[PDB]
Design a protein around this ligand. Structure first.
Ligand SMILES: [Mg+2]
Ligand SMILES: [Mg+2]
Ligand SMILES: [Mg+2]
Ligand SMILES: [Mg+2]
Ligand SMILES: [Mg+2]
Ligand SMILES: [Mg+2]
Ligand SMILES: [Mg+2]
Ligand SMILES: [Mg+2]
Ligand SMILES: [Mg+2]
Ligand SMILES: [Mg+2]
Ligand SMILES: [Mg+2]
Ligand SMILES: [Mg+2]
Lengths: 100, 100, 315, 46, 95, 52
RNA sequence: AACGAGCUUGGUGAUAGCUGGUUACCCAAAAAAUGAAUUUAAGUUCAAUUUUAAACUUGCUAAAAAAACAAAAUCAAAAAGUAAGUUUAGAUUAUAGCCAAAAGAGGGCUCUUCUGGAACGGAAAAAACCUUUAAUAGUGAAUAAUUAACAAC
RNA sequence: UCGGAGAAAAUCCUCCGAAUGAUUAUAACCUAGACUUACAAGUCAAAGUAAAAAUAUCUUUGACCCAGAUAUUUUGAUCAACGGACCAAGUUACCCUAGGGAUUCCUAUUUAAGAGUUCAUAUCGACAAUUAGGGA
């Protein structure tokens, strides 16, 4: 079964706190073929919020998207057609969270 | 083989030029355009080629086309693509041959 | 599935043809290429319906109609409009008035008398031989008292030197009411003279309402006049000079070919050699020659030769 | 496949701050360009 | 072919060319269509008509046939009643 | 199988043309155009040419 | 004195689509290793390229709508930046590529498509990555790329 | 060798057929302009003329030479190695010449259901994790 970065492999619910289900889900995640993590509703929300916050408050004038789209530096000679959509976040089958 | 459009829309086409070759009726004969046995499209006049859509009405004699046409919903009619050559010159001119 | 399906071929055809007329986003072939009368009308109908004899003939499919009665009634009701279609179809309004269109309203009638027994009528688009048009035609158009008129007869495409211009045949001016003999003969009557092999020429009769009598001294022509340089005449500019008092109301036109009488006209009175024309089609297209016409028959050489006779050069 | 590229039009729509930075009026635009080559066309598409 | 013959020291014509092709003096070569006499019972009428025609040769084919024949076959022949009298010359040829 | 047969004009001309006939069927006879007579005449089978 | 068939002379300068070699200077241009047929794949002929000369006229980049498709190339009005192009005459060689980066298909290779490269500078040494319009003399100058980077509450 | 279909313009990629017959209203000659194409071969066709008083309808292949059959017109290939030598198989370790070549279970970490009387990690250890190293 293929799986893409960002997918939720398995879901749990009930009258339990995240802390209760933290350990087992993290253990189960560790043994999954790809990197994975255990996230509650709040944590995934916080995860997206931090990503959007990073983009807004970025102090670097230059960004991968602008350079790639405008062909600045003649850069698209060295880039794949898919890179324009990804915007540098995704390389091969790997996801780089720190990349804005 | 090499089936396709020999002459595109907007081209000057002489009397006998072949416009398109087709295994199936991808295009249909229009005005001043004839049909070959192999279903190829050739001009019948010197002019400019045009491709235009128009409603299709079949010969009454053929049963299958009439039945499909009648079975169409009352709301609308089916369409097809037709090929046209717009004659670019007059049939002839009158000139003074002799004075008596 | 909700909509019904055409159960007959005709329903689709009628839908299709109406569909074709409507304009569409996609490119298509067409782009490139009073109350009292109503009440009286109804009353007559009811009487016709009541008539048993009418029913019996209809069910016996032996009934008939009088054409003459319909024609006269058609003239009163919508003959002006149908006549307008023919004038536009024949190009009269574009060649005469530079695109201006006038509905004919006076039921103009013209006929060329053949001997005395019968007279050839001149309807719209009719065919009359030049021999039949040798003498001037009788004109009755039901003017009514007063309301002076001017009758103008011209061949639109008969000019031999200038394409736009046309040749006057006869012009009657200050025509008072019905009587036409009381008109000043500015232009004497000339027989039609369409050149041989020049196709069909369209000749039209133009009737203009005259508010007040105006002397057309400029348009007067010596009688008889046999000069084509003086018969040249433009309707469009002429109507501009008299548009204040001239408004067209009548039409009648016919098509005529060349004829033996035309030979008489060109020689006897016009006193010139008759012009003869022939329809010439353009030379056939042949691609530019190749020094090596690879994969071409022996006929290839004949396509680009001019003379069919041998030549020997130095020999 | 390396192919000719079509730039989105937004790139060539300037911002008010850009005019201040480069000191060019959006009205009364300049007439003639001064263009110099500062890189090589070797290793660039034909 | 033979460029220098033992007896005369001359070029020799390839007679198989002379037996299949006609040279017009202008420089063109004529030929028949291969198979025009073969299995006519299964060929379409239009196909048979195409086969019956006399056809010209290309520039390279003409160049080869020129090499394979000697000058004698390239001369002017004044045959009385020649049926190719008109086709030994080119008319209105701009190129 | 099928055989190729030579149909001969019966108008007295030597004109003939080859047609294909199924060996089980009777000898073929056709109306065909004779160029030497410029008319449509009967062509009657005269000989078998080959077996198709 | 090396016989699956002796030795010598002659035929004989046997033949060899195979290996090897093929002798002064200067200037200019330059393919590509693609498609087709072949007892053809160690070769050849044709196309295609390239080239010399000549003739006379539009070519290259771009290219709206609009069609053709399904709901980035083909076609190419006007323009603009620019100087090539078409045709005739003559002619060989070539017809095994290599590596990098993209898109696919067979499943790291093996193929097909598209782009680039062949430093005397740089990446240590370095055909293929990056900087680099030719060729010069000078004990001048401004620059390009440029293997480096700054453990946990 | 060729044709049909998918991948989709690649493939030792995956399928179906053809070396056809049937059907007949019998389907001429002549001739612009084009397709396809190294060459060869293969397609479509206005106009004109002529027969008749709607085309043939289904939907393919073999050149040249050379032999036939006729009263001019026709016919000859599993030439299938399908651009086709008119007609020729094995074997060589006795060999020769010209060249081109080559010469899955471990082991270490992470995880820990179960084994271990009781007790996960004294000793081991399923399901898995490691850009972790090794062996027609
Ligand atoms: Mg010895
Ligand atoms: Mg030798
Ligand atoms: Mg070889
Ligand atoms: Mg062979
Ligand atoms: Mg242009
Ligand atoms: Mg450094
Ligand atoms: Mg050919
Ligand atoms: Mg015809
Ligand atoms: Mg072979
Ligand atoms: Mg072969
Ligand atoms: Mg082939
Ligand atoms: Mg032994």
């Amino acid at each position: 079964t293929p799986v893409k970065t960002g997918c939720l492999v398995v879901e749990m619910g009930g009258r339990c706190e995240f802390e209760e289900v933290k350990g087992i889900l993290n253990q189960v995640a560790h043994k999954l073929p790809f990197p994975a993590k255990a996230v509650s509703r709040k944590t995934l929300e916080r995860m997206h919020q931090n990503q959007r916050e990073r983009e807004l408050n970025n102090q670097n004038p230059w960004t991968f998207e602008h350079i790639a789209t405008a062909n600045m530096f003649g850069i698209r000679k060295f880039l794949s057609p898919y890179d324009l959509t990804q915007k540098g976040r995704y390389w091969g089958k790997f996801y780089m969270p720190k990349r804005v | 083989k090499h089936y396709g459009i020999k002459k595109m829309e907007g081209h000057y086409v002489h009397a006998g030029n072949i416009l398109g070759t087709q295994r199936q009726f991808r295009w249909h004969p229009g005005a001043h355009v004839g049909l070959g046995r192999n279903k190829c499209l050739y001009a019948l006049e010197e002019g400019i080629v045009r491709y235009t859509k128009d409603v299709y009405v079949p010969n009454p004699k053929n049963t299958e086309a009439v039945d499909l046409v009648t079975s169409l919903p009352k709301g609308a009619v089916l369409y097809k693509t037709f090929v046209h050559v717009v004659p670019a010159k007059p049939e002839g001119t009158f000139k003074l041959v002799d004075m008596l | 599935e909700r909509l019904e399906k055409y159960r007959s071929f005709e329903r689709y055809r009628r839908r299709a043809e109406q569909e074709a007329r409507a304009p569409h986003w996609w490119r298509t072939y067409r782009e490139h290429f009073r109350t009292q009368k109503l009440l009286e009308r109804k009353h007559f109908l009811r009487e016709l319906r009541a008539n048993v004899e009418e029913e019996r003939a209809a069910r016996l499919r032996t009934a008939s109609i009088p054409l003459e009665a319909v024609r006269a009634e058609w003239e009163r009701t919508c003959g002006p409009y149908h006549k307008q279609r023919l004038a536009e179809y024949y190009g009269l309004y574009r060649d005469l008035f530079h695109g201006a269109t006038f509905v004919p309203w006076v039921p103009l009638h013209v006929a060329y008398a053949v001997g005395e027994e019968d007279l050839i009528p001149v309807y719209h688009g009719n065919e009359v031989t030049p021999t039949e048009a040798s003498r001037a035609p009788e004109v009755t158009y039901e003017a009514d008292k007063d309301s002076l008129w001017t009758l103008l007869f011209i061949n639109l495409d008969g000019h031999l030197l200038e394409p736009d211009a046309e040749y006057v045949h006869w012009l009657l001016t200050n025509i008072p009411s019905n009587r036409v003999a009381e008109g000043q003969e500015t232009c004497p009557y000339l027989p039609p003279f369409p050149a041989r092999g020049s196709g069909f020429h369209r000749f039209a009769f133009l009737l203009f309402k005259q508010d007040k009598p105006i002397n057309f001294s400029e348009d007067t022509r010596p009688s008889p006049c046999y000069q084509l340089a003086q018969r040249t005449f433009r309707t469009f500019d002429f109507y501009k000079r008299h548009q204040e008092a001239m408004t067209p109301a009548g039409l009648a036109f016919f098509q005529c070919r060349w004829d033996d009488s035309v030979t008489h006209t060109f020689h006897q009175l016009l006193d010139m050699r008759e012009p003869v024309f022939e329809f010439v089609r353009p030379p056939p297209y042949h691609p530019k020659q190749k020094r090596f016409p690879h994969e071409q028959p022996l006929r290839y050489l004949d396509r680009y030769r001019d003379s069919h006779e041998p030549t020997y050069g130095i020999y | 496949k390396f192919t000719k590229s079509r730039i989105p039009d937004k790139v060539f729509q300037p911002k008010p701050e850009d005019h201040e930075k480069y000191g060019g009026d959006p009205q009364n635009p300049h007439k003639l360009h001064i263009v110099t080559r500062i890189r090589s066309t070797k290793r660039r598409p034909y | 072919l033979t460029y220098c013959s033992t007896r005369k020291g001359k070029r020799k014509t390839v007679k198989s060319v002379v037996h299949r092709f006609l040279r017009l003096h202008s420089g063109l070569w004529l030929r028949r269509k291969a198979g025009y006499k073969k299995k006519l019972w299964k060929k379409s009428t239009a196909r048979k008509k195409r086969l019956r025609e006399f056809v010209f040769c290309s520039k390279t084919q003409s160049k080869l046939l020129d090499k394979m024949t000697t000058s004698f076959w390239k001369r002017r022949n004044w045959y009385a009643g020649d049926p190719y009298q008109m086709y030994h010359d080119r008319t209105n040829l701009r190129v | 199988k099928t055989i190729l047969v030579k149909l001969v004009s019966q108008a007295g001309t030597g004109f003939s043309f080859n047609h294909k006939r199924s060996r089980l069927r009777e000898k073929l006879s056709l109306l065909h155009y004779d160029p030497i007579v410029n008319k449509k005449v009967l062509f009657v089978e005269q000989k078998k040419i080959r077996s198709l």
